[PDB]
C-alpha cells in the first residue's frame, strides 16, 4: 500500500543547470529507494539505490538524498546526455512501486504549431484505403491535442499519432496524427478537418479540405 509521488512530472531546464527531482513516499520507506534513468526505447538504467548509493559508472554530477518519506535526485550541471525520464522506486523484498516519472527536457519559449492537413494519395485510394494525415510542426511544450472532425462529426478509434524527440537545435516537438478509413467510408463524406488544441494557441486551429 506504499504510494510513490514524483514532482515535477516534466522539468524544463537548460544545459549547465543544477536541478532537483522530488520523490514522495505515502508512508516511511527508510532509504529503500532507487533512482533510474530511462531514454526512449532503451531499457531503464539504475543510477542510485539505498537513497544515496550511486552505482559504479554513474557520473559524479548525479546525487541522491532523503529518508523515510522525502527523497531527492539532484543533477548538478546538466549535460545533453542527462536529458531523459527519471523514475523513483521503492524497492521492498518481494514487491516494488515506481514514481509516475519525470521528463527532464530543454527549456525554451512557448511556440505554437504550424498545422498541415494531407488528403490521401489517389494511388492509395485505388488500393481500397484512405490515410488522412495531420501535421503539428515545431511546437512547444510537448502537450498537444488533435481531434478529427469528418463532416463536423468527431472521430475516435480510427486515428493514431506519434511524436518526435525534442529538436537538436530549435528545442521543439512535432506530432503526426493519421486518420485511417476504408475507400468506401472515405467516399461517404465531403469535409475532412483536423482541430488542434495547444498552449501557444489563443483558440484551437482547424485545418480542413474537401474531396476535390
Amino acid at each position: 500500500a506504499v504510494v510513490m509521488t514524483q514532482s515535477p512530472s516534466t522539468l524544463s531546464a537548460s544545459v549547465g543547470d543544477t536541478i532537483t527531482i522530488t520523490c514522495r513516499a505515502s508512508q516511511s520507506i527508510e532509504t529503500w529507494l532507487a533512482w533510474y534513468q530511462q531514454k526512449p526505447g532503451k531499457a531503464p538504467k539504475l543510477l542510485i539505490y539505498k537513497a544515496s548509493t550511486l552505482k559504479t559508472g554513474v557520473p559524479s554530477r548525479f546525487s541522491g538524498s532523503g529518508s523515510g518519506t522525502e527523497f531527492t535526485l539532484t543533477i548538478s550541471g546538466l549535460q545533453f546526455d542527462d536529458f531523459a525520464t527519471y523514475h523513483c522506486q521503492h524497492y521492498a523484498g518481494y514487491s516494488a512501486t515506481f514514481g509516475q516519472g519525470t521528463r527532464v527536457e530543454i527549456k525554451r519559449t512557448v511556440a505554437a504549431p504550424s498545422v498541415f492537413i494531407f488528403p490521401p494519395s489517389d494511388e492509395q485510394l485505388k488500393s481500397g484505403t484512405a490515410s488522412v494525415v495531420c501535421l503539428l510542426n515545431n511546437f512547444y511544450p510537448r502537450e498537444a491535442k488533435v481531434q478529427w472532425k469528418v463532416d463536423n462529426a468527431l472521430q475516435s478509434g480510427n486515428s493514431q499519432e506519434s511524436v518526435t524527440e525534442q529538436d537538436s537545435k530549435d528545442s521543439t516537438y512535432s506530432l503526426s496524427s493519421t486518420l485511417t478509413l476504408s475507400k468506401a467510408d472515405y467516399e461517404k463524406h465531403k469535409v475532412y478537418a483536423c482541430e488542434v488544441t495547444h498552449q501557444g494557441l489563443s483558440s484551437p486551429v482547424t485545418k480542413s479540405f474537401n474531396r476535390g
Binding site: 498541415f116 510542426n137 506519434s162 518526435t164
Partner: protein, 219 residues
C-alpha cells in the same frame, strides 16, 4: 475428471517466437512426465517435447530441437513451451499431455490431454512497405512520405539521397491494428521553391532489403 488447458496460441510470422502455457485441474504436475504433441494439418500427430519429473531430463523432436524449450512449474502446476525461429511446418494444434496410470510406472501412455491451442506460422517473414506522397497546398509549406503497411522495425528515410536534412522530421513508427507498421516523414520547404526544386524521399527497409524512392509533387 482430470483436466489440462493449453493457452497462448495464434498467428506468427516465419522466424518469430511464441510461448505456450499448459495449466491443469484435479491433479498435481509434480510426479508426472509432461509432454507436448502437435496435430499437423496432414492429420497425424508429432511428439514435440518431454519434460521429466522435476526437470531432470528434457527431450525434443529432431525438427524442434534447438528452437523449442520445455519447462515446468511444479509449485503452481504449469508447463511451458518456448517456440523460436519458427518454421511454417510448425503450424499445428498443440496439445499438452501426461504419462500416466492408476499406479505410476517407469513407462505409461498419455492417459490425459488438453483440448489443444492453434499455432499458425505465416510464410512471409517480412512485409513490403507501400510508399505514398503527402502532397502540399504563408511563404512556407510542408510535404512528406507516408510509409505504410510494412514491417518490421526498422525503416530509415532520407530526403534527396541525403542532400535535404534541414527541416526534415521522421516520426516514430506506429503499430496498426493489423500487425503492420506505418510511419511518416515530412519536411518544411518555402512555398516559392515548390515548382522549381525537386523533392524525393529515400525509404530503406533493411529486413525486406527494400529501397524505394518517391517524388512529391502538388496535384
Amino acid at each position: 475428471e482430470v483436466q489440462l488447458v493449453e493457452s497462448g496460441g495464434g498467428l506468427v510470422k516465419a522466424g518469430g517466437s511464441l510461448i505456450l502455457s499448459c495449466g491443469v485441474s484435479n491433479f498435481r504436475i509434480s510426479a508426472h512426465t509432461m509432454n507436448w504433441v502437435r496435430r499437423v494439418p496432414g492429420g497425424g500427430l508429432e511428439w514435440v517435447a518431454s519434460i521429466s519429473t522435476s526437470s531432470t531430463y528434457r527431450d525434443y523432436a529432431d525438427a524442434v530441437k534447438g528452437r523449442f524449450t520445455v519447462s515446468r512449474d511444479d509449485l503452481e502446476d504449469f508447463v511451458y513451451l518456448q517456440m523460436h525461429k519458427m518454421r511454417v511446418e510448425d503450424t499445428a494444434i498443440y496439445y499438452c499431455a501426461r504419462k500416466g496410470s492408476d499406479r505410476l510406472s517407469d513407462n505409461d501412455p498419455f492417459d490425459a490431454w488438453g483440448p489443444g491451442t492453434v499455432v499458425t506460422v505465416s510464410p512471409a517473414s517480412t512485409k513490403g512497405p507501400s510508399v505514398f506522397p503527402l502532397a502540399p497546398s504563408g511563404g512556407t509549406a510542408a510535404l512528406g512520405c507516408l510509409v505504410k503497411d510494412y514491417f518490421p522495425e526498422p525503416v530509415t528515410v532520407s530526403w534527396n539521397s541525403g542532400a535535404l536534412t534541414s527541416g526534415v522530421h521522421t516520426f516514430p513508427a506506429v503499430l496498426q491494428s493489423s500487425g503492420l507498421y506505418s510511419l511518416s516523414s515530412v519536411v518544411t520547404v518555402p512555398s516559392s521553391s515548390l515548382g522549381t526544386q525537386t523533392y524525393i524521399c529515400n525509404v530503406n527497409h533493411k529486413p525486406s532489403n527494400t529501397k524505394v524512392d518517391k517524388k512529391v509533387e502538388p496535384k
